[PDB]
Amino acid sequence: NTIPIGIALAQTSNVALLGQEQVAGAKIAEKYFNDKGGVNGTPIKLIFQDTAGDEAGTINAFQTLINKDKVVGIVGPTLSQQAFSANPIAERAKVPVVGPSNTAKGIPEIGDYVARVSAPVSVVAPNSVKAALKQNPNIKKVAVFFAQNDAFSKSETEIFQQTVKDQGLELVTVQKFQTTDTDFQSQATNAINLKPDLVIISGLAADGGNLVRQLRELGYQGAIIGGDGLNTSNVFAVCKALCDGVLIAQAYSPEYTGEINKAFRQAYVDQYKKEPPQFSAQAFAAVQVYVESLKALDTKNKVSKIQLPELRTELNKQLLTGKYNTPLGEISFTPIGEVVQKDFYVAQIKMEKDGSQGKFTFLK
Numbered sequence: 001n002t003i004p005i006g007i008a009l010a011q012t013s014n015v016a017l018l019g020q021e022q023v024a025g026a027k028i029a030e031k032y033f034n035d036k037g038g039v040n041g042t043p044i045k046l047i048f049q050d051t052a053g054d055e056a057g058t059i060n061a062f063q064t065l066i067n068k069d070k071v072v073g074i075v076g077p078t079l080s081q082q083a084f085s086a087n088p089i090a091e092r093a094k095v096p097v098v099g100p101s102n103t104a105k106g107i108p109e110i111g112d113y114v115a116r117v118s119a120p121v122s123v124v125a126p127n128s129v130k131a132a133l134k135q136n137p138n139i140k141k142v143a144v145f146f147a148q149n150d151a152f153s154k155s156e157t158e159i160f161q162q163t164v165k166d167q168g169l170e171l172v173t174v175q176k177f178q179t180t181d182t183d184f185q186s187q188a189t190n191a192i193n194l195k196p197d198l199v200i201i202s203g204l205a206a207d208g209g210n211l212v213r214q215l216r217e218l219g220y221q222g223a224i225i226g227g228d229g230l231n232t233s234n235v236f237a238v239c240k241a242l243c244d245g246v247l248i249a250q251a252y253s254p255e256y257t258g259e260i261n262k263a264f265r266q267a268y269v270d271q272y273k274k275e276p277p278q279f280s281a282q283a284f285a286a287v288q289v290y291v292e293s294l295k296a297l298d299t300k301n302k303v304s305k306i307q308l309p310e311l312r313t314e315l316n317k318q319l320l321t322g323k324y325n326t327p328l329g330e331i332s333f334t335p336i337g338e339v340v341q342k343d344f345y346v347a348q349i350k351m352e353k354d355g356s357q358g359k360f361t362f363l364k
């Protein structure tokens with residue numbers, strides 16, 4: 001006997017350039033927690049249902065997990081775009097959802113069954129603008145790009161634009177693109193003609209990487225910030241040496257000294273031969289929230305005897321009250337499921353000259 005927890009992430013499509021790191025973190029969590037006896041001796045069982053890259057696929061994944069797989073709760077989905085469509089399904093069904101990486105404004109507000117462990121754009125994004133200004137205090141002109149079809153990108157770009165204004169900088173253009181575009185020559189040229197000192201990009205990974213590469217190809221030599229959708233080593237293949245120097249805010253640091261981060265990091269590095277990325281740590285934290293909440297609930301009200309609808313409702317109630325020492329740091333939730341988290345960072349892509357290898361360097 002095991003306790004089923006649903007994992008609904010993008011395992012296919014270009015959205016999997018983000019989702020695959022989340023899957024990796026979830027699997028590390030499953031082993032970590034099951035090796036510790038699961039829920040008071042009862043193992044958990046992660047049930048993975050691929051969402052693919054759109055809303056329909058996410059809705060289908062959620063419905064399958066809820067109805068066929070009888071899960072006690074869901075971790076997912078990957079994108080805020082998917083969450084706004086699918087999370088109401090879980091809300092209506094009274095099944096908890098813990099978002100690992102949905103950072104758009106409004107996610108926890110979807111309902112009483114929706115929480116997230118991922119700090120939102122309003123607190124994450126401004127960090128990278130400040131870091132760019134530290135590296136070049138003479139930045140004056142800023143060009144902004146965003147994916148107009150993606151909910152998170154639209155939410156993130158508003159924060160970047162407001163931050164640019166509040167820092168007293170000149171916003172010289174806002175250019176739009178689609179996440180499915182591969183070519184950005186006209187937008188990139190129109191921005192470059194305005195002589196920006198800083199370029200900020202809110203898109204996802206393939207699109208963001210292609211845009212970075214093209215800006216450099218077209219002669220742009222200024223600073224570049226990527227938003228959360230570029231926050232993956234999967235961009236390295238796309239922009240190669242021309243990824244070098246891109247600044248990306250972080251809601252996780254491998255060097256954070258919390259005991260569980262040490263264990264998570266060691267497990268990750270031993271397997272993948274590089275530092276754990278933010279998305280992996282966030283997925284681990286989401287699974288941790290479920291395991292620790294299930295343990296607390298089970299101690300007070302043995303879960304093997306609770307029928308599923310009540311188990312789901314009691315688990316949701318429990319998780320919202322918990323405090324968790326996770327790889328992300330000490331976190332908890334507001335009464336509506338927003339994460340409470342203290343520390344943020346900025347990292348910078350450092351490519352090797354040949355362009356075939358790189359890493360994220362954390363700024364001090």
Ligand SMILES: CC(C)[C@H](N)C(=O)O
Nearest residue numbers: 079080102103152229
């Ligand atoms: C990069 C992506 C996972 C983004 N944080 C979102 O909310 O969709």
Ligand SMILES: [Mg+2]
Nearest residue numbers: 108114336337
């Ligand atoms: Mg909520």
